[PDB]
Design a protein around this ligand. Structure first.
Ligand SMILES: Nc1nc(NC2CC2)cc(-c2cccc(Cl)c2Cl)n1
Ligand SMILES: Nc1nc(NC2CC2)cc(-c2cccc(Cl)c2Cl)n1
Lengths: 155, 153
């Protein structure tokens, strides 16, 4: 009997010359920059989950999200398949605001600090920045080392 | 670091039947499947899919519809198999047995799932309902799935 896939959301506010990231202040991935998101709850849609996490973590509200990717992840030593649903936003309401969990900061699109993002980001950001959609899977040894991956555009 | 190896799979899916091939040798011998194989350097995925369909079944098509993307791994290897799945409806020629595949039509309510790869039981319903999908399956061995993700795109 099977180990369950667990669902997560990730939102990247991607405007014409900049992307909003947040420095994670505690918990899983603390000390790296990332988009906003977290676990999708039982009883909520993925997109409602994404909007909720963007609001709680950054203080931003959105009318529209655009779904851009689906990437699953696994780590050696864990039975859990992490199933991450990735969205973009452009127009937003509110001002980026520091939360308990995240400190938002804008980055120019040619000045993304990839050394301080999850390692996978370096592989799929190019598709994200080109407004493409994609599916993939990454197998990690640990927080720093990818063992293998699959990634391709969907169209 | 491994990158995944690319494969194609083509299901000739008509209103009340689907064409499968019994694999005669190699990896998956003795199971029914669609037609396909390794995508080669220097050909597109879709051209690879047409190529394998022709080589294995003698059928040629004009149009393939992209249906799904599924990655696969087996416990105890970093190798990832990356399968791009396509449908076809109209085909030219006569399904003929090759060295690799024995083609047969199945009515859609009579697909022999026990003799397909185990994952097919999970994604065939999406295929049948014309839904596009992405997924990943981790296999303990050729009969046993440990873990999977599968979602409409
Ligand atoms: N960019 C990126 N890459 C990731 N790579 C996976 C090896 C961890 C995971 C995540 C992510 C997304 C949503 C929620 C959570 Cl907790 C995380 Cl960690 N983000
Ligand atoms: N239906 C299905 N399911 C699969 N499940 C993976 C555990 C093996 C693999 C395949 C497949 C597709 C193209 C080429 C080859 Cl060699 C194979 Cl084996 N097909």
């Amino acid at each position: 009997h099977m180990s369950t896939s667990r669902l997560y959301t990730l939102v990247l506010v991607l405007q014409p010359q900049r992307v909003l990231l947040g420095m994670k202040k505690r918990g899983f991935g603390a000390g790296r920059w990332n988009g906003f998101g977290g676990k999708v709850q039982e009883g909520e849609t993925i997109e409602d989950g994404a909007k909720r996490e963007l609001l709680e973590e950054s203080g931003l509200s959105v009318d529209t999200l655009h779904k851009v990717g689906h990437i699953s992840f696994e780590f050696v030593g864990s039975p859990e398949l992490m199933d991450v649903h990735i969205f973009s936003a452009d127009h937003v309401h509110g001002t980026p605001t520091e939360s308990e969990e995240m400190r938002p900061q804008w980055f120019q699109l040619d000045q993304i600090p990839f050394a301080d993002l999850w390692p996978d980001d370096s592989y799929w950001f190019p598709l994200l920045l080109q407004k493409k959609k994609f599916c993939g899977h990454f197998k990690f040894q640990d927080q720093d080392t990818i063992l293998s991956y699959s990634l391709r555009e969907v169209d």
